[PDB]
Design an enzyme around this catalytic site. Structure first.
Site, mmCIF file in Angstrom:
data_model
loop_
_atom_site.group_PDB
_atom_site.id
_atom_site.type_symbol
_atom_site.label_atom_id
_atom_site.label_comp_id
_atom_site.label_asym_id
_atom_site.label_seq_id
_atom_site.Cartn_x
_atom_site.Cartn_y
_atom_site.Cartn_z
ATOM 1 N N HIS B 327 0.807 -1.296 -0.020
ATOM 2 C CA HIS B 327 -0.091 0.016 -0.184
ATOM 3 C C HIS B 327 0.937 1.331 0.093
ATOM 4 O O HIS B 327 1.641 1.158 0.630
ATOM 5 C CB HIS B 327 -0.850 0.009 1.346
ATOM 6 C CG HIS B 327 -1.761 1.100 1.246
ATOM 7 N ND1 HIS B 327 -1.699 2.124 1.816
ATOM 8 C CD2 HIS B 327 -3.159 1.261 0.857
ATOM 9 C CE1 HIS B 327 -2.421 3.048 1.568
ATOM 10 N NE2 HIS B 327 -3.632 2.460 0.837
ATOM 11 N N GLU B 357 2.842 10.707 -2.943
ATOM 12 C CA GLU B 357 3.858 10.164 -1.771
ATOM 13 C C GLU B 357 4.966 10.877 -1.756
ATOM 14 O O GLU B 357 5.810 10.780 -0.703
ATOM 15 C CB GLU B 357 3.955 8.714 -1.994
ATOM 16 C CG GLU B 357 2.653 7.880 -1.613
ATOM 17 C CD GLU B 357 2.020 8.167 -0.220
ATOM 18 O OE1 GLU B 357 2.894 8.054 0.658
ATOM 19 O OE2 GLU B 357 0.852 8.288 -0.037
ATOM 20 N N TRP B 459 -27.117 7.628 14.001
ATOM 21 C CA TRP B 459 -26.124 7.454 13.171
ATOM 22 C C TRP B 459 -26.803 7.558 11.571
ATOM 23 O O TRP B 459 -26.445 8.219 10.662
ATOM 24 C CB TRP B 459 -25.273 6.306 13.295
ATOM 25 C CG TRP B 459 -24.678 5.694 11.951
ATOM 26 C CD1 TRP B 459 -25.325 4.871 11.171
ATOM 27 C CD2 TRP B 459 -23.320 6.283 11.556
ATOM 28 N NE1 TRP B 459 -24.487 4.612 10.028
ATOM 29 C CE2 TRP B 459 -23.316 5.185 10.221
ATOM 30 C CE3 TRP B 459 -22.530 6.977 11.812
ATOM 31 C CZ2 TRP B 459 -22.307 5.401 9.352
ATOM 32 C CZ3 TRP B 459 -21.407 7.121 11.125
ATOM 33 C CH2 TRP B 459 -21.207 6.415 9.995
ATOM 34 N N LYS B 463 -26.766 10.475 8.644
ATOM 35 C CA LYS B 463 -26.654 10.302 7.196
ATOM 36 C C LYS B 463 -27.416 10.948 6.148
ATOM 37 O O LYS B 463 -27.407 11.251 5.218
ATOM 38 C CB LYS B 463 -26.396 8.861 7.133
ATOM 39 C CG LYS B 463 -25.651 8.415 5.779
ATOM 40 C CD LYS B 463 -25.641 6.974 5.702
ATOM 41 C CE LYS B 463 -24.295 6.524 5.961
ATOM 42 N NZ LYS B 463 -23.240 6.793 5.167
ATOM 43 N N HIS B 487 -10.521 3.245 9.418
ATOM 44 C CA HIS B 487 -9.932 4.086 10.377
ATOM 45 C C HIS B 487 -10.637 3.992 11.679
ATOM 46 O O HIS B 487 -10.020 4.260 12.756
ATOM 47 C CB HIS B 487 -9.961 5.427 9.713
ATOM 48 C CG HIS B 487 -9.156 5.906 8.631
ATOM 49 N ND1 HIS B 487 -9.620 5.506 7.534
ATOM 50 C CD2 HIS B 487 -7.885 6.506 8.751
ATOM 51 C CE1 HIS B 487 -8.440 5.898 6.513
ATOM 52 N NE2 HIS B 487 -7.446 6.338 7.470
ATOM 53 N N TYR B 497 -8.832 14.172 7.712
ATOM 54 C CA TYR B 497 -9.348 14.124 6.314
ATOM 55 C C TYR B 497 -10.191 15.319 5.902
ATOM 56 O O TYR B 497 -10.352 15.750 4.792
ATOM 57 C CB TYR B 497 -10.050 12.788 5.916
ATOM 58 C CG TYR B 497 -9.072 11.708 6.081
ATOM 59 C CD1 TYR B 497 -8.145 11.484 4.976
ATOM 60 C CD2 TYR B 497 -9.010 10.884 6.993
ATOM 61 C CE1 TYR B 497 -6.911 10.564 5.307
ATOM 62 C CE2 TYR B 497 -8.126 9.787 7.082
ATOM 63 C CZ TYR B 497 -7.283 9.519 6.277
ATOM 64 O OH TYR B 497 -6.239 8.652 6.397
#
Ligand SMILES: *[C@@H]1O[C@H](CO)[C@@H](O[C@@H]2O[C@H](CO)[C@@H](O)[C@H](O)[C@H]2NC(C)=O)[C@H](O)[C@H]1NC(C)=O
Ligand SMILES: *[C@@H]1O[C@H](CO)[C@@H](O[C@@H]2O[C@H](CO)[C@@H](O)[C@H](O)[C@H]2NC(C)=O)[C@H](O)[C@H]1NC(C)=O
Ligand SMILES: *[C@@H]1O[C@H](CO)[C@@H](O)[C@H](O)[C@H]1NC(C)=O
Ligand SMILES: *[C@@H]1O[C@H](CO)[C@@H](O)[C@H](O)[C@H]1NC(C)=O
Ligand SMILES: *[C@@H]1O[C@H](CO)[C@@H](O)[C@H](O)[C@H]1NC(C)=O
Ligand SMILES: *[C@@H]1O[C@H](CO)[C@@H](O)[C@H](O)[C@H]1NC(C)=O
Ligand SMILES: *[C@@H]1O[C@H](CO)[C@@H](O)[C@H](O)[C@H]1NC(C)=O
Lengths: 192, 596
Positions: B327, B357, B459, B463, B487, B497
């Site tokens: 990865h 990267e 939850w 959404k 995560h 993020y």
């Protein structure tokens, strides 16, 4: 001639806390062969020209030899302070000599860490120039006394270098020697 | 005779001691990710345990130093990070619930299963089995089964386990003098000790929510447009008056909408910006892919890679016996050792990842002069957003025509840019409501004002409200499907993020103004401008030694997290979307319409 090969091309090199100061005298020395070696990286001369040292010379040709990490090679200079240059090897101002440094990646390193080279990390007072200080006495950070037992303010000074073969160019072990020239009342100078 | 000089002696001892131990742990972890053997797992765990136990001894010694008299700020930040107790406050009977549960989460997530119940043909792992069923197929019935193949076969065994995780990690905050475990993750953004630059822990909730009211009008038109081009493949299966199903958003969780680009292309008649066929004509390899990325950086002004990186890192998939995962990750081993760990391919994504990267490496050597405790990013969002601003520039048509990958005669009309911008909108704009909603749910469950029987009904109801997703099948409270993501199960803070996007476009407008580009932000380039390189390198070299709010003022001049220079990136796309959504039902309310 005098054996410059036993100090430049030696197999074992001393650490910076125990830098050897061997005396070179009564010999002819070819410094022009050092110039075209094409292997040094930090050849800097203080107080002398490369041409002026050939025809005119001095006696008292003490040489200093020790092992310095690559990023901290620049500390070895007159008027320049730091950590190694303040606690291990202090060069005096108006130093009439040259520093000779080159990489030692393939021989002064091993896998798992070459923990054979040490340096003094804590010292009570700053070093006056051209002094070797070999001692095992521990530091005193605060006010409580240390009887040799390590504590929160004792902090044993001799820390070990770690030289892995995959380290960066700044952390490479740079094998460095220092030539010191001075003309005091000692007679019988020998030139090249 | 001062505490200030006693701390500088200890931090000088710790910096040399830790960097010797951290290099041994990083080298052992590097060999685990390249050559997997049975002993290499034990070899990595041997060095990693003594490094973690080393921090246990140093945290106890730094506790006795009082923090009320250190006027120096460089050593104050080092002592605040070193004195984080972490797991040392918990008892031995409670510390054993950390390593047991966290290793159970990794092993459960590593189980790939797509075998049909009462039909056991075969099933592969996550990468060859799960990713193909969400990114390629266009069948509603089996994708609904595939949605329930992971959220009802993997997440069902996490409901007694993840709730045990959130009741003891939450107790750590009172032992660490924090509010809750959600407040513990906000300590990375917390700034104290600077007059006028202080960032409260509770200010992060307000600032994230305040920036979401300008994300929303961009996301209203994006969700309205994509619901009209998705119902074409499913005519009678979704109503174009409500929200979207969860199992039709590219991935299993709907985090990235990159796979909807083929279904929802704006103008597919003209060819896309694709040079994958172009590199195989010029015989590009792994060395030449990363070589042009290196010369891109030295053209900006950043230093080039060292000689102990090209012959030391790996590029392709090596050997046959080495079954190590590759990865794409960036390695900072310390002591000048920097590596990139990925399997190279001649594709669009791997060429951009080569630029992406490499940016973390260029950030990594920037703070090499900093001490070891400050040898990190300014926060958790800086180290990810810095590695992505060069990804935006390398995907530009101007940079592609500079090297020669793109054709020398490629016109740039309206439709050649809407196709490119909507590809960027699905991977950047589309991941913002999913990131904000999930972290908002995780913050309240860590706060504790959500009961056990009210996990799923709250939850799912956000959404539908924030993200705008209708549940493809009703779920009761025994399901634990929000914990199935990578995560959340492995204790990763997902707020890095959301702030990654708001940082990667603040830097993009700041660097483009430094390069004096005449045009919009989508066609802008960073290379061949040493003025923009010097602006970035001044903020990269700071690291964690300075507060992150001072890092923004070194590049953009705004101390807060600005959301305005992101809508300016999508102004060509937003004005077309406003005209395209003249008759479509833009703006969803609460919608139980399709699956009542
Ligand atoms: C240290 O060893 C090297 C390696 O033998 C010596 O370099 C040689 O120098 C002679 C004299 O000019 C040349 O003829 C050789 O070709 C060199 N060898 C290489 C491999 O370059 C160097 O002179 C030695 N230094 C000392 C001080 O003895
Ligand atoms: C960035 O600078 C390089 C270096 O000049 C540019 O490469 C030149 O490109 C032109 C035409 O594209 C060629 O005629 C030159 O021979 C190239 N120079 C070299 C040294 O190869 C590159 O095009 C520039 N990129 C941008 C976007 O301006
Ligand atoms: C790579 O792994 C194989 C077995 O997995 C082993 O035989 C070989 O010695 C390893 N090579 C290196 C360089 O670690
Ligand atoms: C803190 O100490 C370091 C030690 O090098 C120094 O560089 C820095 O300027 C000091 N900061 C303040 C605010 O005194
Ligand atoms: C860490 O734990 C020790 C042990 O009780 C305690 O004295 C110390 O105050 C703790 N540190 C913090 C920051 O809570
Ligand atoms: C990096 O750039 C410098 C400056 O020209 C150059 O001397 C050096 O050889 C370059 N290194 C690599 C690996 O390209
Ligand atoms: C973009 O669309 C407008 C609206 O029709 C048109 O006038 C303009 O010429 C188009 N631009 C290009 C480059 O084709």
């Amino acid at each position: 001639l005098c054996p410059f090969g036993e100090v430049f091309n030696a197999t074992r090199f001393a650490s910076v806390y125990a830098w050897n100061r061997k005396r070179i005298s009564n010999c002819v020395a070819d410094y022009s062969v050092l110039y075209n070696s094409a292997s040094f990286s930090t050849f800097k001369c203080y107080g002398v020209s490369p041409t002026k040292l050939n025809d005119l010379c001095f006696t008292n040709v003490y040489a200093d030899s020790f092992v310095i990490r690559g990023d901290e090679v620049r500390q070895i200079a007159p008027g320049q302070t730091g950590k190694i240059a303040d606690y291990n090897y202090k060069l005096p101002d108006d130093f009439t000599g040259c520093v000779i440094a080159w990489n030692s990646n393939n021989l002064d390193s091993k896998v798992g860490g070459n923990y054979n080279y040490l340096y003094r990390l804590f010292r009570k007072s700053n070093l006056k120039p051209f002094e070797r200080d070999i001692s095992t006495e521990i530091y005193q950070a605060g006010s409580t006394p240390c009887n040799g037992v390590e504590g929160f303010n004792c902090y044993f000074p001799l820390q070990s270098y770690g030289f892995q073969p995959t380290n960066g160019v700044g952390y490479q072990p740079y094998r460095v020697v220092v030539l010191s020239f001075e003309l005091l009342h000692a007679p019988a100078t020998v030139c090249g | 005779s001062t505490i200030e000089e006693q701390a500088k002696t200890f931090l000088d001892k710790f910096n040399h001691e830790a960097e010797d131990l951290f290099y041994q742990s990083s080298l052992a972890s590097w060999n685990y990710n390249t050559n997997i053997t049975e002993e290499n797992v034990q070899n990595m765990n041997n060095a990693g345990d003594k490094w973690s136990a080393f921090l246990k001894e140093q945290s106890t010694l730094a506790q006795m130093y009082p923090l009320q008299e250190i006027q120096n700020l460089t050593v104050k930040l080092q002592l605040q990070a070193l004195q984080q107790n972490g797991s040392s406050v918990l008892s031995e009977d409670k510390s054993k619930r950390l390593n047991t549960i966290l290793n159970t989460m990794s092993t459960i997530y590593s189980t790939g299963k797509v075998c049909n119940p009462d039909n056991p043909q075969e099933c592969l792992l996550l990468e060859p089995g799960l990713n193909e069923i969400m990114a390629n197929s266009l069948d509603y019935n089996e994708r609904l089964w595939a949605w329930e193949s992971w959220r009802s076969e993997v997440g069902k065994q996490l409901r007694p386990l993840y709730e045990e995780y959130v009741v003891l990690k939450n107790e750590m905050a009172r032992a660490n003098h924090y509010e809750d475990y959600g407040d513990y993750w906000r300590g990375d953004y917390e700034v104290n000790g600077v007059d006028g630059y202080d960032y409260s822990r509770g200010q992060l909730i307000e600032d994230v929510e305040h920036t979401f009211e300008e994300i929303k009008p961009l996301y209203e038109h994006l969700h309205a447009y994509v619901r009209a081009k998705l119902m074409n493949a499913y005519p009678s299966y979704i109503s174009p008056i409500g929200c979207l199903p969860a199992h039709l958003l590219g991935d299993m969780w709907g985090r990235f909408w990159t796979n909807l680009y083929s279904l929802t292309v704006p103008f597919g008649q003209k060819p896309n910006i694709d040079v994958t066929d172009a590199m195989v004509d010029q015989a590009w390899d792994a060395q030449r892919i990363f070589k042009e990325a290196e010369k891109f950086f030295v053209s900006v002004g950043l230093p080039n890679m060292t000689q102990g990186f090209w012959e030391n890192s790996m590029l392709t998939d090596p050997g046959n016996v080495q079954k190590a995962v590759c990865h794409p990750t960036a390695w900072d081993l310390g002591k000048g050792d920097f590596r990139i760990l990925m399997c190279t391919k001649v594709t669009m994504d791997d060429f951009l990842t080569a630029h992406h990267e490499m940016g973390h490496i260029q950030y990594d050597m920037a703070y090499a002069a900093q001490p070891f405790l400050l040898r990190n990013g300014a926060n958790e969002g800086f180290h990810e957003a810095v590695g992505e601003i060069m990804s935006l520039s390398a995907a530009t048509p101007k940079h592609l025509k500079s090297i020669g990958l793109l054709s020398p005669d490629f016109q740039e009309d309206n439709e050649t840019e809407i196709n490119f911008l909507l590809k960027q909108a699905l991977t950047i704009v589309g991941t913002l409501p999913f990131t904000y909603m999930l972290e908002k749910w995780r913050w309240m469950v860590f706060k504790g004002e959500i009961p056990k029987d009210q996990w799923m009904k709250k939850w799912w109801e956000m959404k539908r409200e924030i993200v705008g997703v209708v549940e493809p099948v009703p779920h009761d409270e025994t399901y634990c499907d929000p914990a199935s993501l990578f995560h959340v199960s492995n204790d990763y803070s997902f707020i890095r993020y959301y702030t990654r996007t708001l940082y990667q476009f603040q830097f993009q407008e700041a660097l483009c103004q430094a390069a004096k580009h005449e045009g919009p932000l989508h066609k802008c380039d960073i290379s061949n401008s040493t003025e923009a390189g010097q602006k970035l390198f001044n903020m990269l070299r700071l690291g964690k030694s300075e507060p992150w709010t001072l890092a923004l003022e070194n590049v953009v001049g705004a101390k807060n997290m600005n959301v305005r220079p992101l809508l300016n990136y999508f102004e060509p796309l937003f004005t077309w979307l406003k005209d395209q959504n003249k008759n479509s039902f833009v703006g969803w309310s609460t919608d139980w319409s399709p699956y009542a």
